[PDB]
Amino acid sequence: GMEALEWQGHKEPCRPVLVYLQPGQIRVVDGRLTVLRTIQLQPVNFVLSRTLLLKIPKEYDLVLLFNLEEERQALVENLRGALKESIQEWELREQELMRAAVTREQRRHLLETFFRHLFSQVLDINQADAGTLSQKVREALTCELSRAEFAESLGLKPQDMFVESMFSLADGYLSFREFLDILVVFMEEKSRLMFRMYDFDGNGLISKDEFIRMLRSFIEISNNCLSKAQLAEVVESMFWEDFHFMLRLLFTEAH
Amino acid sequence: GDKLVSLSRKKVEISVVKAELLPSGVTHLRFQRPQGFEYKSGQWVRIACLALGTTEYHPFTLTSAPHEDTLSLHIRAAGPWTTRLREIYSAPT
Amino acid sequence: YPKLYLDGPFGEGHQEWHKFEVSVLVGGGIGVTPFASILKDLVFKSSVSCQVFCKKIYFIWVTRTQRQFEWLADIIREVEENDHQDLVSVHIYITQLAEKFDLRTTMLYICERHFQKVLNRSLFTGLRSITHFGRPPFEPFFN
Ligand SMILES: Cc1cc2nc3c(=O)[nH]c(=O)nc-3n(C[C@H](O)[C@H](O)[C@H](O)COP(=O)(O)OP(=O)(O)OC[C@H]3O[C@@H](n4cnc5c(N)ncnc54)[C@H](O)[C@@H]3O)c2cc1C
Ligand SMILES: NC(=O)C1=CN([C@@H]2O[C@H](COP(=O)(O)OP(=O)(O)OC[C@H]3O[C@@H](n4cnc5c(N)ncnc54)[C@H](OP(=O)(O)O)[C@@H]3O)[C@@H](O)[C@H]2O)C=CC1
Incomplete structure (x- = not known):
């Protein structure tokens, strides 16, 4: 380690x-011998710029800083x-690397406007509230979070009834x-x-797999045992308008 | 400034419940507590008696405990104001 | 944990709401941190004492977002949980525009008006008190 x-x-x-x-897992730890992250590789991409940003597949992007550019090369070779x-491996601009990979502020700023776009119909707010300018939105929604991180994202404690109940449902x-x-x-x-x-592109057509994903999600709404086979049979017999x-x-009473 | 501050304070108007002519020329005045009257032990108030028609405020230590529903003062007949208060409160009604 | 140096209270704690049978406590922004104490104190009084002059207390919390003040939500939760005499009615007013909502505000709004309650407690916060979105209607409230 270094x-x-x-x-x-x-x-x-x-x-x-x-x-x-380590081969199975790369561990970033604090100076007080406190582990901060342990990323395990499943048989990911890297970008260099002094800065090395490894983009985790389904986790938070990890950006590390090097003492020197040659030190950056040595550390990159070892890693x-x-x-x-x-x-x-790729190379981009420092500002481009910072604003391109998923950061905490950027992820929150994207998720807030995505949620507002989703629930505009309920909030009675026009869809022109903000700009969600697709693939990175899918990555942000894909990132699974621990209980503490999710509760922090929602401003709750890890052991609150709401987060724990929704984790039990999940x-x-x-x-x-x-x-x-x-x-x-x-x-x-x-x-x-x-x-x-599920309409990330906004074209209005869930092409091939989003329909089955929506069927599986609506099954996750209704607890059952034969879920997968029943959903497959329903899709086979059946085939927005997909809602029909x-x-x-x-x-x-506030203004 | 001091007179303006004295004007700024709102002088409550209250009524007496009981008056005792205690020996050695003492007056025990037990009177009604204003609704939001909160005080600690050893604190003192000012009183005026318009039956004298004088509008004088004199200081007296609260001899009743804060847990009591009324307020008690043990006024010693030390001079004109105190003696006049004693004699005016001597008679009923 | 480290040790602290404490310099005692400087508050000079005026409590004129005990002088009124009905009081309306309005908290705004950062000026609502004390009220937690106040609220708890009030309910504690209503628990131990019986002939209290303040028969009903209204707590109008007004805030843009509950960010950095989420703990006050749990404080209000315990306050209303222990309020066995219905002394305190709480009203939270989120004044943030719907176009600038963060995750917590969207979740609170939907759990308030687009997600069914459980025991008249919002699934997100858990408060019987109703959260409203917009400027508090102060003079219709007074009437
Ligand atoms: C904090 C405090 C608490 C007191 N508590 C009591 C009490 O519980 N019972 C009690 O009998 N007496 C108390 N006194 C004494 C108080 O001064 C009486 O009101 C006074 O004896 C009234 O005198 P008089 O005006 O009738 O006669 P005066 O002849 O006018 O008074 C003679 C004496 O009273 C004093 N005095 C008069 N007016 C005032 C005033 N406005 N402020 C201060 N001193 C004055 C003078 O210094 C003088 O020595 C207290 C005084 C103070 C400062
Ligand atoms: N007792 C006191 O003297 C206090 C003074 N302050 C002072 O206030 C300043 C800012 O407070 P801050 O912590 O930012 O509070 P915030 O502005 O973050 O929150 C206050 C709430 O009141 C609403 N509000 C604010 N100003 C007005 C106004 N002029 N008219 C109507 N509604 C209003 C806001 O709604 P929206 O923004 O959506 O309109 C917001 O929801 C601080 O500098 C502080 O010194 C703060 C607390 C107590």
């Missing part, structure tokens, strides 16, 4: 940490050897996709909301 710096977004200060490169022992981790999939089904208009939720196919005194 001592280096880790970035935490535009608004957060860098943290001096240490890197240990690449350790990772390949148990493989795509079950070790949770992605926002499953979260709002449970939420909307537990919330006829639900079909339209779910369809528009699926269906086939005190005064406190």
